[PDB]
Design a binder for this molecule. Structure first.
Ligand SMILES: Nc1ncnc2c1ncn2[C@@H]1O[C@H](COP(=O)(O)OP(=O)(O)S)[C@@H](O)[C@H]1O
Length: 454
């Protein structure tokens, strides 16, 4: 190891410690955070070979096996449910099919689960920002039956409720309603899991989606009739869930009907000077993706990864640039970030990939910030890491957390902490992430930015 690299390692160790100190002092200064729109329930079942074989045999083995080779990508019956699970096994492929049959939803609910967990980008961040970081959080919960409400951790997590004509903020467990359970059934299996002659080449999971409301970005009445009152209680907002929108719906609805409401919420937010952050998850429909780019000028910040940025370059960049962004080639990434800012004029773009983060901010000149991250060799959990990175950096920076790069450093600690411990309970635990070595390949990469850029 050359001394030029040993010194950089020493420097980044100090920056990480100071970035964590700064974040601990600024996070308490955030008046409140608004989180919308997607919250649901995640039901995890660890598949048992015998149980699954009994259920396949009971419903018709040939029917289920017919489906494996002729998948319908839409669960209309119990045999299509089992056939889809077995196909995810055979291929070791991550799959998710929508459940359009009430009868099998009863079968799913009856079949049960091993672990029950909050879902939706807005939901998981309510437990993080509110439960761990202790920031007053207002979260949008489309449907809040008892099963949904109990999944929020203790802390300053609130939902709006109407007391006749007044709006009140209460913990989700105190605002239970006779509403639908929005459950995503997640069936996990390891490598080697065998059912009849079907053996998994790798670990993976099959998801039976039984949630009609988040699929349409349903908004509950309190958020449509009391948004202004809600906005007065928050300083920041993080928006998500819009990646699902279809161009047309059976009842005649379009994506534009939902984005009209979203645009009205942004107008209210900007009127109160609330800083907003959009989570630009991969949006299959190209036209909806185009409308979301057109809506970014009303956002303060946007967060995305190599897949999501490459997907956006497919419609405002060139195919070659997208293919390089997808692989994390930093220079192509920087270009794509400037192309996105040129197209939208947004104030802040936060890019995260394996090894390093980037933040392009503008105001008095475009300024680029770069940090090498902390990679865990064997994560205990990998779900919600991306939301944790975007939310942590956004709340830390705009909380007065020490600047853009310091906010990225904190997000890198929060990501590493969640990975090595699985689930975070209090912010003090993130301190343990300081011991995770900083990615040296990314540290050396910064030398290339210092040559090209001056
Ligand atoms: N081992 C490990 N340790 C710490 N952090 C990690 C690790 N592996 C990946 N990452 C980060 O998580 C992101 C993957 O989540 P994505 O961007 O897909 O968002 P999601 O919400 O889907 S997890 C990816 O961009 C990385 O910056």
């Amino acid at each position: 190891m050359k001394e030029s690299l040993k010194d950089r390692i020493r420097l980044w160790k100090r920056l990480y410690v100071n970035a964590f100190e700064n974040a601990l002092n600024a996070i308490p200064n955030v008046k409140g955070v608004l989180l919308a729109y997607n919250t649901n329930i995640d039901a995890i079942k660890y598949l048992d070979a015998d149980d699954l074989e009994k259920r396949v045999t009971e419903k018709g083995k040939e029917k289920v096996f017919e489906i494996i080779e002729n998948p319908p990508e839409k669960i209309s019956s119990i045999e299509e449910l089992l056939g889809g699970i077995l196909r995810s096994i055979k291929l070791g492929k991550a799959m998710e099919w929508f459940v359009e049959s009430e009868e099998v939803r009863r079968y799913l609910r009856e079949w049960g689960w091993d672990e029950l967990r909050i879902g939706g980008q807005a939901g998981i961040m309510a437990n993080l920002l509110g439960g761990v970081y202790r920031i007053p959080t207002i979260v949008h919960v489309p449907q809040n039956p008892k099963l949904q409400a109990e999944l929020f951790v203790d802390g300053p997590i609130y939902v709006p409720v109407f007391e006749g004509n007044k709006l009140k903020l209460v913990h989700p467990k105190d605002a239970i309603a006779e509403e639908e359970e929005l459950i995503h059934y997640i069936y996990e299996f390891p490598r080697g899991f065998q059912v009849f002659d079907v053996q998994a080449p790798r670990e993976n999971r099959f998801i039976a989606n039984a949630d009609d409301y988040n699929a349409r970005v349903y908004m509950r009445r309190e958020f449509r009739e009391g948004f202004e009152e809600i906005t007065r209680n928050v300083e920041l907002a993080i928006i998500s869930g819009l990646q699902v929108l279809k161009e047309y719906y059976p009842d005649g609805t379009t994506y534009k009907d939902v984005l009209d409401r979203v645009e009205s919420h942004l107008n209210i937010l900007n009127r109160y000077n609330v800083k907003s952050h959009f989570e630009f998850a991969y949006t299959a429909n190209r036209r909806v993706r185009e409308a979301l780019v057109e809506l970014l000028p009303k956002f303060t910040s946007v967060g995305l990864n190599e897949v999501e940025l490459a997907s956006i370059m497919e419609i405002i960049g060139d195919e070659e640039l997208a293919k390089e962004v997808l692989e994390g080639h930093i220079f192509s990434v920087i270009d794509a970030m400037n192309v996105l800012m040129d197209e939208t004029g947004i104030e802040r773009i936060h890019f995260h990939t394996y090894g390093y983060y980037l933040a392009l901010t503008q105001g008095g000149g475009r300024q680029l910030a770069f940090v090498p991250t902390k990679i865990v060799a064997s994560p205990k959990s990998t779900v919600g890491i991306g939301d944790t990175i975007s939310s942590s950096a956004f709340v830390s920076e705009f909380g007065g957390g020490g600047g853009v790069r310091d906010a990225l450093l904190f997000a890198s600690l929060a990501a590493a902490a969640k990975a090595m411990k699985g689930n975070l309970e209090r912010i003090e635990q993130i301190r343990d992430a300081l011991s995770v070595p900083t990615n040296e390949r990314a540290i050396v990469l910064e030398e290339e930015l210092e040559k090209e850029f001056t």
